[PDB]
Amino acid sequence: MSLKVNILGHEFSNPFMNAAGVLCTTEEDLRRMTESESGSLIGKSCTLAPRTGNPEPRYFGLPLGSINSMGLPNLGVDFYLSYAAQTHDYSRKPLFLSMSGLSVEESVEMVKKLVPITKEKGTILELNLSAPNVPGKPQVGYDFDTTRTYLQKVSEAYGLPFGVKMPPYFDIAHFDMAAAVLNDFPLVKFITCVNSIGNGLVIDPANETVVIKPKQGFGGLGGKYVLPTALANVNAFFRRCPDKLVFGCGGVYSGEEAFLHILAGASMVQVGTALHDEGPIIFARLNKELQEIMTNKGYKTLDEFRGRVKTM
Amino acid sequence: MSLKVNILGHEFSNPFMNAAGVLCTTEEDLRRMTESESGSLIGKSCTLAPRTGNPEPRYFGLPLGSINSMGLPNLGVDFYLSYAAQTHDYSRKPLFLSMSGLSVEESVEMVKKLVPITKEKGTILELNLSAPNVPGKPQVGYDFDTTRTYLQKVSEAYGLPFGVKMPPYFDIAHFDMAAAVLNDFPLVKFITCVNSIGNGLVIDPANETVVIKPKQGFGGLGGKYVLPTALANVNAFFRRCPDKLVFGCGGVYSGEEAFLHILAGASMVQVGTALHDEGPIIFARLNKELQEIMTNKGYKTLDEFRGRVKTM
Ligand SMILES: Cc1cc2c(cc1C)N(C[C@H](O)[C@H](O)[C@H](O)COP(=O)(O)O)c1[nH]c(=O)[nH]c(=O)c1N2
Ligand SMILES: Cc1cc2c(cc1C)N(C[C@H](O)[C@H](O)[C@H](O)COP(=O)(O)O)c1[nH]c(=O)[nH]c(=O)c1N2
Ligand SMILES: O=C(O)/C=C/C(=O)O
Ligand SMILES: O=C(O)/C=C/C(=O)O
Numbered sequence: 001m002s003l004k005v006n007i008l009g010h011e012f013s014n015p016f017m018n019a020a021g022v023l024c025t026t027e028e029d030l031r032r033m034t035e036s037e038s039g040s041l042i043g044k045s046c047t048l049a050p051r052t053g054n055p056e057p058r059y060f061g062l063p064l065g066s067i068n069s070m071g072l073p074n075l076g077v078d079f080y081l082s083y084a085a086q087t088h089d090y091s092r093k094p095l096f097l098s099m100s101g102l103s104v105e106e107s108v109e110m111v112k113k114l115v116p117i118t119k120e121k122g123t124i125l126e127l128n129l130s131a132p133n134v135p136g137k138p139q140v141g142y143d144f145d146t147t148r149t150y151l152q153k154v155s156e157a158y159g160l161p162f163g164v165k166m167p168p169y170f171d172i173a174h175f176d177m178a179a180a181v182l183n184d185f186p187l188v189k190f191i192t193c194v195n196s197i198g199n200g201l202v203i204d205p206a207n208e209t210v211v212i213k214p215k216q217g218f219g220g221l222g223g224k225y226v227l228p229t230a231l232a233n234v235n236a237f238f239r240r241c242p243d244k245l246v247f248g249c250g251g252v253y254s255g256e257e258a259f260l261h262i263l264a265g266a267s268m269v270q271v272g273t274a275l276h277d278e279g280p281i282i283f284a285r286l287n288k289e290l291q292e293i294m295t296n297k298g299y300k301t302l303d304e305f306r307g308r309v310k311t312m
Numbered sequence: 313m314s315l316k317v318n319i320l321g322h323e324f325s326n327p328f329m330n331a332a333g334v335l336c337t338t339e340e341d342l343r344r345m346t347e348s349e350s351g352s353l354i355g356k357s358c359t360l361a362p363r364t365g366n367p368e369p370r371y372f373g374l375p376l377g378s379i380n381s382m383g384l385p386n387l388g389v390d391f392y393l394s395y396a397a398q399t400h401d402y403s404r405k406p407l408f409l410s411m412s413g414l415s416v417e418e419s420v421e422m423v424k425k426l427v428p429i430t431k432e433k434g435t436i437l438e439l440n441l442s443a444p445n446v447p448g449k450p451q452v453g454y455d456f457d458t459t460r461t462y463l464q465k466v467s468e469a470y471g472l473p474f475g476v477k478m479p480p481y482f483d484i485a486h487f488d489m490a491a492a493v494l495n496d497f498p499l500v501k502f503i504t505c506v507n508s509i510g511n512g513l514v515i516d517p518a519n520e521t522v523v524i525k526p527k528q529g530f531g532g533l534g535g536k537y538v539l540p541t542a543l544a545n546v547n548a549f550f551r552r553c554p555d556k557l558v559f560g561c562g563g564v565y566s567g568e569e570a571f572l573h574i575l576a577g578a579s580m581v582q583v584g585t586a587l588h589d590e591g592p593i594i595f596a597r598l599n600k601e602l603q604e605i606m607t608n609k610g611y612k613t614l615d616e617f618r619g620r621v622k623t624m
Binding site for chain 2: 064135169172197201202207210212215216217218224232235259263293310312
């Protein structure tokens with residue numbers, strides 16, 4: 001029995017890691033992720049300068065998942081670059097950093113700074129193209145022209161293998177266009193599907209009031225709301241981008257959901273809402289439950305079923 | 313106490329109607345809708361010529377709602393025109409008809425046929441710009457240039473007040489862009505938010521197979537998955553298109569969800585997945601549950617709280 005994933009030169013113990021934005025903003029956070037049973041971890045989506053984010057309340061836990069408008073609260077690119085350079089124990093597990101400049105200029109400047117650390121330490125870049133909670137800033141991934149610009153300029157400035165955290169798409173034509181852009185950039189070695197289902201509204205019937213303060217209650221949705229969306233996106237990019245990996249993200253609460261992600265095509269499986277609720281101890285549970293399903297089915301490795309979902 | 317609604321020069325006994333596609337394809341379906349306590353009803357999204365739709369299985373009930381790839385099964389526009397002009401009992405309730413031409417040309421031809429019957433009978437048109445289950449046809453509402461063309465040609469052809477069935481949006485810039493196009497068409501008097509969350513994917517862990525045959529498992533999501541997206545879309549168009557009505561659609565199982573939709577701005581509330589599961593008795597239950605909530609809050613009319621959602 002093995003949960004191991006061997007990708008991009010690294011041996012991951014299992015396919016699990018935090019989703020960008022959950023338990024990865026502060027040094028304490030990253031330490032707790034490093035000490036967890038997770039296969040990897042990813043730093044909070046950072047900007048050039050620090051950000052404090054949106055006003056409170058900006059996170060509300062729901063029966064079926066979560067709503068948030070965090071606003072990219074981060075300690076600044078320099079803090080995360082220092083975590084990657086000086087602090088992080090790589091013998092424990094590989095490290096990803098999420099970078100989320102609020103313009104292409106910004107992202108280009110941050111990405112250059114990672115090149116030397118990537119080269120010395122092996123730190124992996126995930127470019128955030130799905131920031132849904134910044135007032136006045138659109139999700140880049142729903143504009144295929146802008147996406148192209150970002151991938152072009154980041155490819156040039158970084159010049160090493162990276163991946164892209166995509167917004168969820170809801171239309172076949174969009175899968176086609178998205179894939180057409182991505183496939184023109186060979187340095188894009190992995191696609192993380194998906195980010196929050198953007199700009200949901202949750203209202204409390206009791207007090208007739210929204211549950212979050214920013215943007216009139218409008219926040220990205222995670223948790224059980226997102227699983228079918230996540231699987232669809234994972235599979236669609238799995239098929240259309242065979243030269244690339246796909247990382248699954250959305251609605252993972254257990255091994256069963258992790259199994260479906262991998263079955264859909266996922267190499268690594270990211271956990272957000274559920275990790276927020278349960279804490280990094282969830283990864284111990286996920287490993288055992290995923291081992292359980294594989295044992296019951298007679299799968300010895302993830303490679304036996306990765307992307308082997310059956311159609312009718 | 314009163315659940316009455318006055319809009320488009322018509323009186324409705326209550327805000328509840330079926331969602332296009334649910335209990336509305338056959339004459340039996342529409343009689344059953346007419347005989348229910350629903351305030352209105354809408355005919356299945358029709359085409360010029362009849363369709364039988366996608367192969368089976370094409371629907372699957374889920375704990376949190378539904379996935380479907382029906383493929384616009386419909387008896388043809390002449391059948392629904394005939395139902396509107398000859399069969400339908402307008403003393404019971406007003407009738408909507410959903411037209412869903414798969415091209416501009418087909419829609420122009422169809423709406424032109426509706427004009428005489430709208431004039432003589434009061435039949436209201438809902439233009440479907442969110443058909444996510446017809447292979448090789450994108451959802452029009454995600455292409456603002458195409459959307460513009462439809463509203464242009466339908467406006468000049470039909471030349472009477474009508475509504476649009478929009479796909480869900482998940483990005484602020486898209487709300488703005490959608491609203492900007494819609495606000496250039498004065499004959500668009502109501503926006504139905506929202507259609508299925510499109511191109512989701514359900515996999516059965518047990519047999520490692522998708523649950524619907526068409527499009528490799530990819531189908532539209534309804535029910536509990538959709539509520540937060542539904543409300544956000546309702547409220548976003550309520551604010552951005554103040555010279556239009558918003559019809560609420562998505563995640564309505566009970567009086568509470570109906571109350572949230574109306575609070576967020578909805579004039580009428582359409583019911584899909586839950587009506588499909590429970591049958592037309594649901595409208596009696598919804599009428600009484602909405603009144604129960606209103607009784608508990610001291611509301612006498614829908615206009616005491618319609619559009620009065622509180623922000624922080
Ligand atoms: C509190 C919080 C914070 C963030 C997020 C989510 C949540 C809940 N998300 C989105 C997240 O990474 C993930 O895509 C979704 O949460 C969906 O996964 P789950 O269904 O929650 O497991 C997010 N994504 C990203 O790329 N960068 C980020 O900084 C954040 N921040
Ligand atoms: C079986 C079935 C059939 C259809 C649909 C759905 C389902 C479940 N839907 C979408 C429907 O009108 C509605 O927008 C969504 O189902 C969301 O509402 P619920 O959460 O299901 O109440 C749909 N919409 C539309 O505009 N025309 C149609 O013909 C259909 N057909
Ligand atoms: O920090 C946030 O508000 C979310 C970021 C994301 O969804 O990418
Ligand atoms: O008939 C269907 O397949 C779906 C219709 C609706 O989503 O427009």
